[PDB]
CSV table of C-alpha atoms and ligand atoms in Angstrom, one decimal:
chain,number,residue,atom,x,y,z
A,1,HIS,CA,205.4,-25.5,69.9
A,2,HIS,CA,205.7,-21.5,72.3
A,3,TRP,CA,206.4,-18.8,70.2
A,4,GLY,CA,210.3,-17.4,69.8
A,5,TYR,CA,212.7,-15.8,67.1
A,6,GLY,CA,214.1,-19.0,65.6
A,7,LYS,CA,212.9,-20.0,61.7
A,8,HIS,CA,209.9,-22.1,63.2
A,9,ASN,CA,208.4,-20.2,66.0
A,10,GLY,CA,209.3,-16.7,65.2
A,11,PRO,CA,207.4,-12.9,64.5
A,12,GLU,CA,206.3,-14.9,61.0
A,13,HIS,CA,204.4,-17.2,62.9
A,14,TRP,CA,203.0,-15.5,65.6
A,15,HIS,CA,199.6,-14.8,64.0
A,16,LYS,CA,198.3,-18.0,64.6
A,17,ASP,CA,198.4,-17.9,68.7
A,18,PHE,CA,198.1,-14.8,68.8
A,19,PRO,CA,195.4,-13.2,65.9
A,20,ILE,CA,195.9,-9.6,67.1
A,21,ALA,CA,199.6,-9.7,65.0
A,22,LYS,CA,197.7,-8.5,62.1
A,23,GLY,CA,195.7,-6.0,64.1
A,24,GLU,CA,194.9,-2.4,63.3
A,25,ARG,CA,198.0,-1.0,65.1
A,26,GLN,CA,200.8,-2.8,65.5
A,27,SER,CA,204.7,-2.4,66.2
A,28,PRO,CA,207.0,-1.7,65.8
A,29,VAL,CA,206.8,0.8,62.6
A,30,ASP,CA,209.3,2.1,60.2
A,31,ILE,CA,209.3,6.0,61.0
A,32,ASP,CA,209.6,8.2,57.9
A,33,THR,CA,210.9,11.2,59.3
A,34,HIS,CA,209.3,13.2,56.0
A,35,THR,CA,205.9,12.1,56.8
A,36,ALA,CA,205.9,12.7,60.7
A,37,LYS,CA,204.1,15.6,61.6
A,38,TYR,CA,205.3,18.2,64.1
A,39,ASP,CA,202.4,19.0,66.8
A,40,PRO,CA,203.0,22.2,68.3
A,41,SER,CA,200.7,20.9,71.3
A,42,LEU,CA,202.8,17.7,72.4
A,43,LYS,CA,204.1,18.8,75.8
A,44,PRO,CA,208.3,18.1,76.5
A,45,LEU,CA,208.5,14.9,78.1
A,46,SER,CA,208.6,14.8,82.4
A,47,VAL,CA,210.9,11.7,83.5
A,48,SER,CA,211.2,11.4,87.0
A,49,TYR,CA,213.7,8.8,87.8
A,50,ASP,CA,215.8,9.5,90.6
A,51,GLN,CA,214.2,7.5,93.3
A,52,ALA,CA,213.6,5.0,91.5
A,53,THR,CA,214.4,1.7,93.2
A,54,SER,CA,215.4,-1.6,91.2
A,55,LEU,CA,214.9,-5.3,92.4
A,56,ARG,CA,216.3,-7.8,90.0
A,57,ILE,CA,217.1,-8.4,86.3
A,58,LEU,CA,216.1,-12.2,84.6
A,59,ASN,CA,216.4,-13.8,81.9
A,60,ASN,CA,213.1,-14.7,80.1
A,61,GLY,CA,213.8,-16.7,77.2
A,62,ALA,CA,213.0,-13.6,75.1
A,63,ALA,CA,215.1,-11.1,76.5
A,64,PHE,CA,216.2,-10.2,80.2
A,65,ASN,CA,214.6,-7.4,82.4
A,66,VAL,CA,215.9,-5.4,84.9
A,67,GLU,CA,213.2,-4.9,87.2
A,68,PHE,CA,211.7,-2.0,89.1
A,69,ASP,CA,209.9,-1.6,92.5
A,70,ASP,CA,206.4,-0.3,91.2
A,71,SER,CA,204.5,0.1,94.7
A,72,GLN,CA,204.8,3.7,94.8
A,73,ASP,CA,205.4,6.8,92.0
A,74,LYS,CA,209.3,6.2,92.5
A,75,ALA,CA,210.3,6.5,88.9
A,76,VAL,CA,207.6,8.2,86.9
A,77,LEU,CA,206.9,9.3,83.4
A,78,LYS,CA,204.7,12.4,82.3
A,79,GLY,CA,204.2,14.8,79.8
A,80,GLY,CA,204.6,14.6,76.0
A,81,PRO,CA,201.4,13.1,74.5
A,82,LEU,CA,200.1,11.4,78.5
A,83,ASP,CA,197.4,11.6,80.0
A,84,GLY,CA,198.1,11.0,83.8
A,85,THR,CA,201.0,9.2,85.9
A,86,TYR,CA,202.8,6.5,84.0
A,87,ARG,CA,205.0,4.1,86.5
A,88,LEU,CA,208.3,2.6,85.8
A,89,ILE,CA,208.3,-1.4,86.2
A,90,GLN,CA,210.7,-2.6,83.7
A,91,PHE,CA,213.7,-2.1,80.7
A,92,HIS,CA,214.7,-4.2,78.4
A,93,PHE,CA,216.5,-4.5,74.9
A,94,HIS,CA,216.2,-6.1,71.8
A,95,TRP,CA,219.2,-6.6,69.8
A,96,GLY,CA,220.9,-8.6,66.7
A,97,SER,CA,223.5,-11.0,65.6
A,98,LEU,CA,225.6,-8.1,63.6
A,99,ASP,CA,225.6,-4.1,64.2
A,100,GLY,CA,223.7,-3.8,61.3
A,101,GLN,CA,220.4,-4.4,62.9
A,102,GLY,CA,218.8,-4.7,66.2
A,103,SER,CA,216.2,-2.3,66.3
A,104,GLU,CA,212.8,-2.7,66.2
A,105,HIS,CA,211.6,1.0,65.1
A,106,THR,CA,213.6,2.0,62.2
A,107,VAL,CA,214.2,5.3,61.1
A,108,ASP,CA,214.0,6.1,57.4
A,109,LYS,CA,214.2,2.3,57.1
A,110,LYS,CA,217.9,2.7,59.1
A,111,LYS,CA,218.3,0.2,61.5
A,112,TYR,CA,220.3,0.7,65.0
A,113,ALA,CA,222.3,-2.4,66.6
A,114,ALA,CA,220.0,-2.6,69.8
A,115,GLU,CA,216.8,-0.6,71.4
A,116,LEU,CA,216.5,0.3,74.7
A,117,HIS,CA,212.6,-0.4,75.8
A,118,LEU,CA,211.4,1.3,79.5
A,119,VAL,CA,208.4,-0.2,80.0
A,120,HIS,CA,205.9,1.8,82.5
A,121,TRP,CA,201.8,2.0,82.9
A,122,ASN,CA,199.0,3.9,83.8
A,123,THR,CA,198.7,4.5,87.7
A,124,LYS,CA,194.9,5.2,87.2
A,125,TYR,CA,194.5,1.4,86.3
A,126,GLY,CA,196.1,-0.1,89.3
A,127,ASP,CA,198.4,-2.7,88.4
A,128,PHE,CA,200.2,-3.7,84.8
A,129,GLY,CA,198.3,-7.1,84.3
A,130,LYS,CA,194.7,-4.3,83.9
A,131,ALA,CA,196.5,-1.7,82.1
A,132,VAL,CA,197.5,-3.9,79.4
A,133,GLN,CA,193.9,-4.0,78.8
A,134,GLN,CA,193.5,-1.0,78.0
A,135,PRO,CA,194.5,1.8,74.5
A,136,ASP,CA,196.0,3.9,77.6
A,137,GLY,CA,197.3,1.1,79.4
A,138,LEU,CA,200.9,1.4,78.6
A,139,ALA,CA,203.8,4.2,77.5
A,140,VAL,CA,207.0,3.1,76.4
A,141,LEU,CA,210.0,4.8,76.1
A,142,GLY,CA,212.5,3.4,73.1
A,143,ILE,CA,215.8,4.4,72.9
A,144,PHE,CA,218.3,3.3,69.8
A,145,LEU,CA,221.7,2.3,70.8
A,146,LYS,CA,224.7,2.7,68.1
A,147,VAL,CA,228.0,1.1,68.5
A,148,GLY,CA,230.5,3.7,69.1
A,149,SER,CA,232.2,4.8,72.0
A,150,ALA,CA,230.9,2.9,75.2
A,151,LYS,CA,227.8,3.7,77.6
A,152,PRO,CA,229.5,3.7,81.1
A,153,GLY,CA,226.1,4.0,83.0
A,154,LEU,CA,225.1,0.3,81.4
A,155,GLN,CA,228.4,-1.2,82.1
A,156,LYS,CA,226.5,-2.8,85.3
A,157,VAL,CA,224.0,-4.0,83.1
A,158,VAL,CA,226.7,-6.0,81.1
A,159,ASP,CA,228.8,-7.0,84.3
A,160,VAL,CA,225.7,-9.1,85.7
A,161,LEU,CA,224.6,-10.9,82.5
A,162,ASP,CA,226.8,-13.9,83.0
A,163,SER,CA,224.9,-14.8,85.9
A,164,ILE,CA,222.1,-14.8,84.3
A,165,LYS,CA,222.8,-16.6,80.9
A,166,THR,CA,220.0,-18.9,81.0
A,167,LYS,CA,216.4,-18.5,80.9
A,168,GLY,CA,214.9,-18.5,84.0
A,169,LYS,CA,217.8,-17.4,85.6
A,170,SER,CA,217.5,-14.1,88.2
A,171,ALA,CA,219.9,-12.3,90.8
A,172,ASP,CA,219.7,-9.1,92.5
A,173,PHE,CA,220.0,-6.0,91.1
A,174,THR,CA,220.1,-3.4,93.5
A,175,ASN,CA,220.8,0.9,92.8
A,176,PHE,CA,220.8,0.9,89.3
A,177,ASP,CA,219.8,4.3,88.7
A,178,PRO,CA,218.2,3.8,85.1
A,179,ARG,CA,219.1,7.9,84.0
A,180,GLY,CA,222.7,6.8,82.7
A,181,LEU,CA,221.0,5.5,80.0
A,182,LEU,CA,219.0,8.3,78.8
A,183,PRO,CA,220.2,10.6,76.2
A,184,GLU,CA,221.1,14.2,76.3
A,185,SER,CA,217.9,15.3,74.5
A,186,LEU,CA,214.5,14.0,74.8
A,187,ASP,CA,213.2,15.1,71.0
A,188,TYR,CA,210.5,12.3,70.4
A,189,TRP,CA,208.2,11.0,67.6
A,190,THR,CA,205.1,9.5,68.9
A,191,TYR,CA,201.9,7.2,67.8
A,192,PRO,CA,200.1,4.7,69.3
A,193,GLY,CA,201.3,1.0,68.9
A,194,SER,CA,201.6,-2.7,71.1
A,195,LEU,CA,203.9,-4.1,72.7
A,196,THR,CA,206.0,-5.7,70.3
A,197,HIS,CA,205.7,-9.5,71.1
A,198,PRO,CA,203.3,-11.9,72.8
A,199,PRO,CA,200.6,-11.1,73.5
A,200,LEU,CA,201.3,-8.2,71.3
A,201,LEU,CA,198.0,-6.7,73.0
A,202,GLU,CA,197.8,-3.1,71.4
A,203,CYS,CA,197.3,-1.1,74.6
A,204,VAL,CA,200.8,0.9,74.0
A,205,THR,CA,201.4,4.9,72.8
A,206,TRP,CA,205.1,4.7,72.2
A,207,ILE,CA,207.6,7.3,72.6
A,208,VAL,CA,210.9,7.2,70.5
A,209,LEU,CA,213.5,9.1,71.3
A,210,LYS,CA,215.5,10.6,68.4
A,211,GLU,CA,218.8,11.2,69.6
A,212,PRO,CA,220.6,7.0,70.0
A,213,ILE,CA,223.1,6.5,72.6
A,214,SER,CA,226.3,4.8,72.0
A,215,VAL,CA,227.4,2.0,73.7
A,216,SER,CA,231.1,0.1,72.7
A,217,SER,CA,231.5,-3.0,70.7
A,218,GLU,CA,232.4,-4.5,73.4
A,219,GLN,CA,229.5,-3.9,75.5
A,220,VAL,CA,227.1,-5.0,73.1
A,221,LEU,CA,228.9,-8.5,72.4
A,222,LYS,CA,228.0,-9.3,75.8
A,223,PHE,CA,223.9,-9.4,75.5
A,224,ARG,CA,224.8,-11.8,72.8
A,225,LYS,CA,226.4,-14.2,75.0
A,226,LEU,CA,223.1,-15.1,76.6
A,227,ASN,CA,220.8,-17.8,75.6
A,228,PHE,CA,217.9,-18.5,74.5
A,229,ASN,CA,217.6,-22.2,76.4
A,230,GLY,CA,217.0,-22.9,80.3
A,231,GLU,CA,219.8,-24.5,81.1
A,232,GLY,CA,221.1,-28.2,80.6
A,233,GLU,CA,219.9,-27.6,77.3
A,234,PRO,CA,221.4,-27.4,73.2
A,235,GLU,CA,223.0,-23.7,73.0
A,236,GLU,CA,221.2,-20.9,71.1
A,237,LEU,CA,222.4,-17.7,71.0
A,238,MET,CA,220.0,-15.0,72.2
A,239,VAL,CA,220.4,-12.3,69.2
A,240,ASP,CA,217.6,-11.0,66.8
A,241,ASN,CA,215.1,-10.9,69.1
A,242,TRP,CA,213.4,-8.0,67.2
A,243,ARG,CA,210.0,-8.0,65.1
A,244,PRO,CA,210.2,-6.3,61.8
A,245,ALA,CA,208.2,-3.4,60.8
A,246,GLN,CA,204.6,-3.6,60.6
A,247,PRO,CA,202.1,-1.9,58.2
A,248,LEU,CA,201.5,1.8,59.6
A,249,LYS,CA,197.8,1.5,58.5
A,250,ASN,CA,195.4,4.4,59.7
A,251,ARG,CA,197.8,6.2,61.8
A,252,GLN,CA,200.0,9.4,61.9
A,253,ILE,CA,203.3,9.8,63.4
A,254,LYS,CA,203.6,12.8,65.5
A,255,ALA,CA,207.1,14.8,66.0
A,256,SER,CA,207.8,16.9,69.6
A,257,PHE,CA,210.3,18.9,67.3
A,258,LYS,CA,210.6,20.4,63.7
B,1,ZN,ZN1,210.7,-4.2,74.0
């Protein structure tokens, strides 16, 4: 049937319906910290989320998305390796069934409990749909999550998960400030890649933060109570919704720090 993260429709099967899965700039990848090249020309990231307007949270069957109003430059990302302004449209996570796995990118083969993806699109293209068709259409900020101390700013998201347990369910989710999900440092690694789930389009400039944020065991546990299935269907826990590392091939990972 359609793609998923199960044994018969998982990542290893995606290439049949989405040939680009075996493309030249697929994500995620393993970040070899010793092979990454420090680029002194990379500017600091500029995150302007003070005017962010969250609208809704939704379970789309692959993860849960927190959506924002992207009709104006309210929450934008600029600087770094980017040219122009990128508007935040949504953020979601990828996590595992155990604390030892869950992230998509890895650092020197190290896996984290989860990975947060803040998706932004290049305003020069007018809308998200047009942006995904361009090589510089999206900018995704990736943040690693490690299990330890609780993250206060994530609790509001955790508490509403019960209302969107199954696929297709959505709930009003206003006044959420994404700034509460950022680590102290904005040092990063960057490389040209793709969306990590179908359609797997190669339209992403990845910006992966070096510093992970910590969340508590209890917070991640609640992520694991979501369902891939829709209401009224056999229960399948939403866990391990991550794609394994792909070949770096003809690409170089640059670091903003040395
Ligand atoms: Zn993602």
